[PDB]
Structures are given as structure tokens and as C-alpha cells.
């Protein structure tokens, strides 16, 4: 069976001539994915592997579009050809299943659909046989993080030959020697175990499902589907970025009117604890006090921020909070945090309190309090909550039905279901969720638009204490790996880079100041933190103006240029909403450890309109190690016929507001 992208450049051939059902993929008539197996093994049920033959194919197609409530673009185009391939094996130990393929111009998605059939009752998948067999893997280059490690998704990216990527998380991005970029991920991860990729014979990446502590991967009763497996394929690195395939493979919004989900910017009592000027627990330096929160709320109201995150407000942080998962209360504040007074003050100032639920990995202690916790927050006019699941890989703690503790992975079926329960329960209270230590993004924000962002990668916090901090190349890695999954709460915007001393050997953001500004356009998130202490913004009002101006919700987004681990340039047009007319464009660009010159056409600007570019760029002598603060701010009239030369310093950047005139 064969299905092709609408433009014909991606062609999938599905076969039954090999040991098992298999598929392969060509791009512009060159094989990029060789014969790759399909099927399942179960704990007790007979396997779905060899001797299945194709009995039927059903072709259809789609040419449609839909609108996001919020997002990196307002209108999403869905154009694909589709084939459903049915496989059957005669008895004994026979069966039937189908695989549905969708071929877009930017990539492929496929999933299994196992129908009701005799003998398929309570089953436990122990292995998914799905492969991604990369052609010419010996000359391919990959940029990846290891899977099943103690630090979960929070690793710096490795740059290696593809054959060296032994066991990796997705999105898993690489290029072949032709320059074709490919990224493997998944979409709509619901009631199933996350896929990790396990390189078997060279270049053959086999699905490796994250298991329960008991050892099985996925429990199902009767007929079941898998999540979509996705293979993005593009001629250029930015073709991976500009695809909507992940969103397009998710089910439409199930929450109805979600106008209560509000994109915006926030600050927080947060960074002070990470650089040790405050504590999460009680005492002389406690961050989360009534007085401190009112001070942050005053600052937010004056400078245009919608909410204040406060961590350490609830009892249980005293001592070593990493170990306190059993004792956190999610309803009882410390005596120096007056929720009633702050609820009053939030209404007075118009600044929201943003809630915080750290579990330190004990999801059962959280689950038993979760209804009371969201009831309190709903009663307190809290609309957004940051959650947290701090624990080593494989060390989620649950209490089972018999009162016995078990350890689970963050990305097994158990936790996949646990995260979605939290998001669905929050939605009943009109609360949106920002998940730290999450399951990776698989596009579910389409279906549940209150799941607004997540961490799931090394963000700014690792620049406070990472030892080492994030390297100069980190952003340019995230842009083509982690960010292909969806929005990230990176908490950009550190203005005081010197709290541990300058140079290359201290814990600090290893960037220039202008690069901190560029992050607001380079790294998409519907909520963006101004992460620094308020006094550090007051020291640099002119630079701070960019953070005050920049929106977080976009009518259109375009990655103009870039290369994985080297640089990226984004242009985005603001969405008309609240304060924003919808006429301004924004640009952000960052580089890695190298200073870089990038020529950019401004032909993304609206034709026939005049703009004033407000350019925030590295000063002439800027360099991140000992001169990160040199900064130039320039205003220049431009139109779509103009061009710009970006000059990025070492670990530098540029941020631009294109203000439409008239
Ligand atoms: Ca974290
Ligand atoms: Cl960074
Ligand atoms: Mg590089």
C-alpha cells in the first residue's frame, strides 16, 4: 500500500513481505526510512508480529483549517492524504489490526487501531514493535538527550553521529548527509506509556515504552488505539519548526468556551530562592510572605504583568524540601502568608496570584488533597497554577490500593493519566496548568486548552546552580528539539547576570543581555515570565521596555532561518487581543558560542505598511563572558522591501519590535 503527501514529496510504502508488517518512507524519491517493523508483544496474549497480511486499504484525504483559542498562530491548516491499512492473521493465534497513516507535506503520522475481537480482553502490552529504521545512519548527525536517566528531560543536548544515540527521548532530531532534517516524536499521548527510542541494530530505533513498576508497559481492556507516532521531514531545519503536524494530530478542543484561559506575562517570588537570597521554607529569609507578595503585585501592576507566582506559600517546605513529598499541604499556608488579604489585594491591584503545587514526587499525597486545593484557589480568584513533580527519574511515589508505596516513571501510563486528571480537574475550576517536571508535550493543548505550558527541559533555573549552567548553544538546541513538542516555560529575562561573578566558570546564564530579550520571541509560551528580581529590572528600564511591550500570543509565527545548535531567527505577528492591536510584528534571534552575522529580509512585514523597528541588539564590543551587558537600542523606519543584518555577539541575540504606524 502507498500513501503520499499532498505535494508528492513524502511517500510511505506499507508492506507485508517482511517478517512482520512494515513501512518505509522516501523523501523526493530517496529512501530516508528503511523497512521498519510494526506490531505488539503482550504479557499473556499471543503476539501481533509475523504472518499478518494486508487485506484492505481505505484511502481518504483532508483539506481544512481551524482556529486556535491561543497559540503561536491563529489559523492552522490541515492538508493530508490518509490511508488505513488492515492486517489479518489466520487462526490459531490469529487476529487483526489496522494502522492509519496521515501524510502531510511536512511529515507523517501513524497509529495502530486494534478492533474488538475474540480473545482480546484485558491485555498488557509488554513491547511495541514499531521501528524507525534510518537509512544511511552511519553518516547522519543527531542532537539528543538520553532517556531513562536520573535527570529525566533536564539534560543538555549531545551532538553525535546518529549511531551513537543509544537510548533517547523525543522529539529526537537528526539530519542525514544529504542535509534532510528528520524528527521523531508522538502526538496525543493519552492512556498509554510514553515512547522512548532504543537503537537496536545500527540505525534501527525501536519503540521502548516506559513501563509500570510491575514491568508491563500498557494496560488496556479490549479494543485500543496507540498515540500517533510522528516523523517530521524537511529540506531545512526551519521546516521542522514551522510544521503544525503535532497539533493537527490531536483531537479538537473538548472544553468548550476557554476564554477564561489568559495568555500573558508574569513575575514571581521564585528566582530569589534559586540564587539563595530567599528560602522556600519558613524563617528570616522566607520568600512567600504577605509583604513580599504585595510588593511584587505593586510592581506587576505598575509595569504591566498579569500575575505573580509565589512558591513556598504552603506548609511542608521546611528542611530539605526535596524529601518532603509526604508532608506538603496544598490547602494550609504558612502563618506569614495571608491568602485572604492577598485575595483582597489581587482584586485591588488587578494582579492575579498564580498558584503553586509542588509534590516532590508524591502524587498520592497531592491527589488526596487536589479537590480541596483547587476549591481554595477558585475561592481565592486564582486562575493559573504551576505544578511540580521533583524527584529522580523512576522515583514518582504512589500509594497503591493496599497502602503500599510504589515507584513509577514520570512518563509511564500511570503518570500520563495522572497529569491529565490534574488538568481536567483544574479545568472544572477554570484553572490553567503550567507543569514542571512534566510528561513531554504531545499537542494535547489543542484538546485541553487550559494545559498552557510546561517545562520538561533545562530552563533558566539551571543557570542559577547547574554546575555547569546551560551552555551558549542551549537555546539553539531547544529550538529544534524540545520546542518541536510545543510551548515551554523557560522563564527568560535575567537582567543581573553577575550574582555569582562574571566569566565562563560561574553559575549564571552564559548569554548576553540582548539574548535574554530575544528569548521572548524565540521560545514560544502563552505565558512568559520576567524571571528576575524586580530591582534588577528597575536598574535597566530601557532594556526592560522590550519585556513590557512583547506579547505572548501570536496570529502567525515564522522561523526565518537557523541551524540546529548554531542559531535561530523567529518572526511573529501579534494576535489581536486585549492590549494588542494585532498590527505589530516581533523578531528574536540567538546564536550559540560563536558570534554570527545573519542577513534577514523584512518581507514578512505587511505589504504597503510602514513600521518603526525598535531594535535591541548586542553592543559593538559585547561578548558573553566578561562583557554581556553592552547593548544598543535603535529606532529605524522600515517596510517589507527592507533587509537587516543581524550581528550577534558570542552567545548573543537581538530582539525587535516592528511597530506599525498610522
Ligand atoms: Ca524544574
Ligand atoms: Cl540558557
Ligand atoms: Mg553550534
H or E element at residue 410? none
Q: How many Å apart are CA 143 and CA 160, to the nearest integer?
A: 7
Cell of 569: 531567527
Q: How many Å apart are CA 14 and CA 5, to the nearest integer?
A: 14
Which letter does DSSP use for residue 630 in this model? -
Quote the crossing angle between the two packed helices 513-522 and 541-549, to the nearest 10°: 0
For residues 125 and 218, is the Cβ–Cβ distance under 8 A? yes
In angstroms, this model's resolution equals 2.0
Q: How many Å apart are CA 467 and CA 454, to the nearest integer?
A: 23
Between the CA of 2 and the centroid of ligand 1 the distance, in Å, is 43
Cell of 369: 488533597
Q: Which residue has the cell 558560542?
A: 593
Between the CA of 236 and the centroid of ligand 1 the distance, in Å, is 31
For residues 486 and 457, is the Cβ–Cβ distance under 8 A? no
Q: Which of the residues 418, 461, 473, 574 is marked catalytic?
A: 461
Reference 120, options 50, 191, 51, 221; nearest CA is: 221
H or E element at residue 639? none
**Method of determination?**
X-ray
Q: How many Å apart are CA 467 and CA 151, to the nearest integer?
A: 14
Q: Among all ligands shown, which has an atom nearest to the Cα of 457?
A: 1
- Can you spell out the DSSP letters for 534-565? HHHHHT-HHHHHHHHH--S-EEEEEEEEEETT
User: What domains are there in the chain, each with its CATH number?
Assistant: 1-253 (no CATH), 254-662 (3.20.20.70)
Tell me the CA end-to-end span of the chain in Å, nearest whole number: 56
H or E element at residue 332? none
Q: Among all ligands shown, which has an atom nearest to the Cα of 456?
A: 1
Q: Among all ligands shown, which has an atom nearest to the Cα of 274?
A: 1
Cell of 621: 564590543
Helices (H), 429-488: 462-465, 474-478
Between the CA of 504 and the centroid of ligand 2 the distance, in Å, is 13
For residues 42 and 123, is the Cβ–Cβ distance under 8 A? yes
Which letter does DSSP use for residue 629 in this model? T
For residues 327 and 397, is the Cβ–Cβ distance under 8 A? no
Q: Can you give 100-140 as a three-state secondary structure string?
A: EEEEECCEEEEEEEECCCCCCCEEEEEEECCEEEECCHHHC
Cell of 288: 512567600
Q: Among all ligands shown, which has an atom nearest to the Cα of 156?
A: 2
**CA separation, residue 589 to residues 139, 490, 494, 556, 652 (Å):** 29, 16, 17, 17, 8
For residues 382 and 355, is the Cβ–Cβ distance under 8 A? yes
For residues 588 and 551, is the Cβ–Cβ distance under 8 A? no
**CA separation, residue 202 to residues 24, 44, 131, 307 (Å):** 16, 30, 12, 50
Who contacts 296 (Cβ-Cβ below 8 Å, separation ≥6)? 267, 268, 269, 308, 310, 534
Q: How many Å apart are CA 128 and CA 136, to the nearest integer?
A: 24
Reference 248, options 185, 172, 188, 181; nearest CA is: 188
Between the CA of 618 and the centroid of ligand 1 the distance, in Å, is 29
Between the CA of 524 and the centroid of ligand 2 the distance, in Å, is 15
Q: Among all ligands shown, which has an atom nearest to the Cα of 388?
A: 1
Q: Among all ligands shown, which has an atom nearest to the Cα of 472?
A: 2
- For residue 638, the cross-strand partners are 611
For residues 32 and 180, is the Cβ–Cβ distance under 8 A? yes
How many whole angstroms from its chain centre is CA 381?
27
Q: Among all ligands shown, which has an atom nearest to the Cα of 470?
A: 2
Between the CA of 300 and the centroid of ligand 2 the distance, in Å, is 24
**CA separation, residue 617 to residues 460, 611, 620, 656 (Å):** 21, 18, 9, 8
Q: How many Å apart are CA 167 and CA 199, to the nearest integer?
A: 6
Q: How many Å apart are CA 202 and CA 138, to the nearest integer?
A: 8
Between the CA of 454 and the centroid of ligand 1 the distance, in Å, is 10
Residue 258: CB atoms within 10 A of its CB come to 17
Between the CA of 309 and the centroid of ligand 1 the distance, in Å, is 15
SS3 387: strand
Q: Strand 141-144 to strand 158-161: parallel, antiparallel, or no bridges (unpaired)? A: antiparallel
Between the CA of 595 and the centroid of ligand 2 the distance, in Å, is 16
SS3 195: strand
Q: How many Å apart are CA 537 and CA 530, to the nearest integer?
A: 9
- Residues with beta carbon < 5 A to ion ligand 3? 473, 565-566, 592
Q: Among all ligands shown, which has an atom nearest to the Cα of 469?
A: 2
Q: How many Å apart are CA 525 and CA 175, to the nearest integer?
A: 26
Between the CA of 553 and the centroid of ligand 2 the distance, in Å, is 22
Give counts: helices (H), strands (E), the chain: 12, 38
Reference 181, options 474, 440, 519, 568; nearest CA is: 568
Who contacts 222 (Cβ-Cβ below 8 Å, separation ≥6)? 116, 120, 121
For residues 96 and 89, is the Cβ–Cβ distance under 8 A? yes
Between the CA of 651 and the centroid of ligand 2 the distance, in Å, is 9
Burial 136-151 (b: 16+ CB within 10 A, else e): ebeebbbbbbbbbeee
Between the CA of 12 and the centroid of ligand 3 the distance, in Å, is 33
C-alpha torsion sign, points 389, 395, 396, 402: negative
Between the CA of 565 and the centroid of ligand 2 the distance, in Å, is 12
Burial 96-107 (b: 16+ CB within 10 A, else e): bbbbbbbbbbbb
CB burial of residue 78 (10 Å; 0-12, 13-18, 19+): middle
Q: Among all ligands shown, which has an atom nearest to the Cα of 463?
A: 2
- For residue 42, the cross-strand partners are 125
Beta strands in 551-621 (DSSP E): 554-563, 567-574, 585-591, 596-601, 611-618
Between the CA of 46 and the centroid of ligand 2 the distance, in Å, is 49
Cell of 300: 506587576
Q: How many Å apart are CA 211 and CA 535, to the nearest integer?
A: 47
- For residue 12, the cross-strand partners are 3, 25
Burial 390-411 (b: 16+ CB within 10 A, else e): bbebbbbbbbeeeeeeeebbbb
Active-site residue 461, yes or no?
yes
> SS3 helix, strand, coil % of the chain, rounded to 5?
20, 35, 45
Q: Which residue has the cell 511597530?
A: 659
CB burial of residue 196 (10 Å; 0-12, 13-18, 19+): buried
Which letter does DSSP use for residue 584 in this model? -
Who contacts 246 (Cβ-Cβ below 8 Å, separation ≥6)? 185, 187, 230, 441, 442, 443, 484, 485, 486
**Alpha-carbon Rg of the chain, whole angstroms?**
25
Between the CA of 253 and the centroid of ligand 1 the distance, in Å, is 28
Q: How many Å apart are CA 634 and CA 435, to the nearest integer?
A: 37
Between the CA of 455 and the centroid of ligand 1 the distance, in Å, is 7
Q: How many Å apart are CA 616 and CA 648, to the nearest integer?
A: 11
- For residue 570, the cross-strand partners are 559, 588
Q: How many Å apart are CA 287 and CA 291, to the nearest integer?
A: 10
Q: How many Å apart are CA 555 and CA 570, to the nearest integer?
A: 14
Q: How many Å apart are CA 324 and CA 365, to the nearest integer?
A: 11
Between the CA of 178 and the centroid of ligand 2 the distance, in Å, is 30
Amino acid at each position: 500500500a502507498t500513501v503520499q503527501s499532498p505535494d508528492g514529496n513524502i511517500k510511505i510504502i506499507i508492506s507485508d513481505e517482511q517478517s512482520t508488517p512494515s513501512y518505509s518512507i522516501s523523501f523526493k524519491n530517496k529512501t530516508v526510512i528503511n523497512n521498519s517493523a510494526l506490531g505488539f508483544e503482550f504479557k499473556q496474549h499471543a503476539p501481533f508480529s509475523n504472518s499478518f497480511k494486508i487485506t484492505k486499504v481505505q484511502q481518504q484525504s483532508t483539506n481544512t483549517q481551524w482556529q486556535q483559542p491561543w497559540g503561536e498562530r491563529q489559523t492552522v491548516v490541515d492538508q493530508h492524504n490518509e490511508v488505513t491499512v488492515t492486517f489479518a492473521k489466520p487462526q490459531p493465534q490469529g487476529g487483526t489490526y489496522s494502522v492509519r497513516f496521515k501524510a502531510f507535506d511536512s511529515g507523517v503520522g501513524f497509529r495502530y487501531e486494534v478492533p474488538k475481537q475474540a480473545g482480546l480482553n484485558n491485555i498488557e502490552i509488554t513491547k511495541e514493535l514499531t521501528e524507525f529504521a534510518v537509512n544511511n545512519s552511519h553518516t547522519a548527525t543527531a542532537w539528543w538527550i538520553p532517556a531513562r536517566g536520573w535527570n529525566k528531560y533536564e539534560y543538555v543536548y549531545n551532538t553525535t553521529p546518529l549511531n551513537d544515540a543509544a537510548l533517547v527521548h523525543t522529539p529526537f532530531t537528526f539530519k542525514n548527509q544529504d542535509g534532510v532534517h528528520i524528527s521523531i516524536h508522538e502526538a496525543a499521548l493519552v492512556d498509554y506509556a510514553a515512547m522512548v527510542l532504543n537503537q537496536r541494530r545500527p540505525g534501527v530505533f525501536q519503540a521502548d515504552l516506559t513501563p509500570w513498576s510491575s514491568g508491563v508497559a500498557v494496560k488496556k481492556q479490549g479494543a485500543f488505539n496507540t498515540p500517533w507516532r510522528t516523523i517530521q521531514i524537511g529540506e531545512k531545519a526551519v521546516d521542522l519548526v514551522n510544521s503544525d503536524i503535532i497539533l493537527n494530530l490531536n483531537e479538537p478542543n473538548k472544553l468548550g468556551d476557554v476564554s477564561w484561559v489568559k495568555p500573558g506575562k508574569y513575575i514571581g517570588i521564585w528566582w530569589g530562592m534559586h540564587i539563595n537570597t530567599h528560602t522556600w521554607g519558613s524563617g528570616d529569609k522566607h520568600g512567600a510572605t504577605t509583604k513580599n507578595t504585595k510588593y511584587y503585585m505593586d510592581f506587576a501592576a505598575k509595569y504591566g504583568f498579569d500575575g505573580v507566582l509565589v512558591e513556598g506559600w504552603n506548609t511542608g517546605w521546611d528542611g530539605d524540601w526535596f524529601f518532603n513529598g509526604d508532608v506538603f499541604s496544598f490547602t494550609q499556608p504558612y502563618d506569614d502568608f495571608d491568602i485572604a488579604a492577598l485575595t483582597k489585594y489581587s482584586k485591588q491591584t488587578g494582579v492575579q496570584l498564580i498558584g503553586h503545587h509542588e509534590t516532590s514526587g508524591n502524587v498520592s499525597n497531592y491527589r488526596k488533597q487536589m479537590a480541596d486545593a483547587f476549591a481554595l484557589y477558585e475561592k481565592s480568584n486564582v486562575s493559573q497554577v504551576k505544578t511540580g513533580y521533583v524527584a529522580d527519574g523512576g522515583n514518582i511515589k504512589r500509594i497503591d490500593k493496599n497502602g503500599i508505596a510504589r515507584h513509577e516513571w514520570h512518563d509511564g501510563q500511570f503518570m500520563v493519566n495522572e497529569y491529565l486528571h490534574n488538568v481536567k480537574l483544574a479545568a472544572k475550576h477554570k484553572i490553567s496548568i503550567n507543569t514542571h517536571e512534566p510528561i513531554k508535550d504531545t499537542g494535547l493543548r489543542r484538546t485541553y486548552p487550559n494545559w498552557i505550558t510546561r517545562e520538561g527541559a533545562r530552563g533558566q533555573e539551571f543557570n542559577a546552580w547547574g554546575t555547569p549552567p546551560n551552555p551558549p548553544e542551549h537555546i539553539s538546541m531547544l529550538a529544534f528539539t524540545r520546542m518541536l513538542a510545543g510551548p515551554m516555560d523557560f522563564t527568560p529575562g535575567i537582567f543581573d547576570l553577575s550574582f555569582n561573578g562574571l566569566g565562563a566558570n560561574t553559575n549564571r546564564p552564559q548569554t548576553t543581555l540582548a539574548k535574554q530579550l530575544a528569548l521572548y520571541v524565540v521560545l514560544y509560551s502563552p505565558i512568559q515570565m520576567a524571571a528576575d528580581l524586580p530591582k534588577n529590572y528597575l536598574a535597566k528600564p530601557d532594556a526592560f521596555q522590550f519585556i513590557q511591550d512583547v506579547p505572548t500570543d501570536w496570529q502567525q509565527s515564522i522561523a526565518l532561518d537557523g541551524a540546529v545548535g548554531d542559531f535561530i531567527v523567529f518572526a511573529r505577528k501579534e494576535r489581536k487581543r486585549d492590549k494588542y492591536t494585532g498590527n505589530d510584528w516581533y523578531l528574536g534571534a540567538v546564536t550559540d558560542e560563536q558570534a554570527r552575522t545573519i542577513e534577514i529580509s523584512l518581507d514578512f512585514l505587511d505589504n504597503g505598511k510602514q513600521f518603526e523597528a525598535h531594535i535591541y541588539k548586542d553592543g559593538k564590543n559585547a561578548e558573553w563572558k566578561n562583557n554581556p551587558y553592552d547593548l544598543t537600542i535603535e529606532k529605524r523606519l522600515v517596510t517589507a522591501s527592507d533587509k537587516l543584518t543581524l550581528k550577534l555577539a558570542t552567545s548573543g541575540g537581538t530582539a525587535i519590535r516592528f511597530k506599525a504606524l498610522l
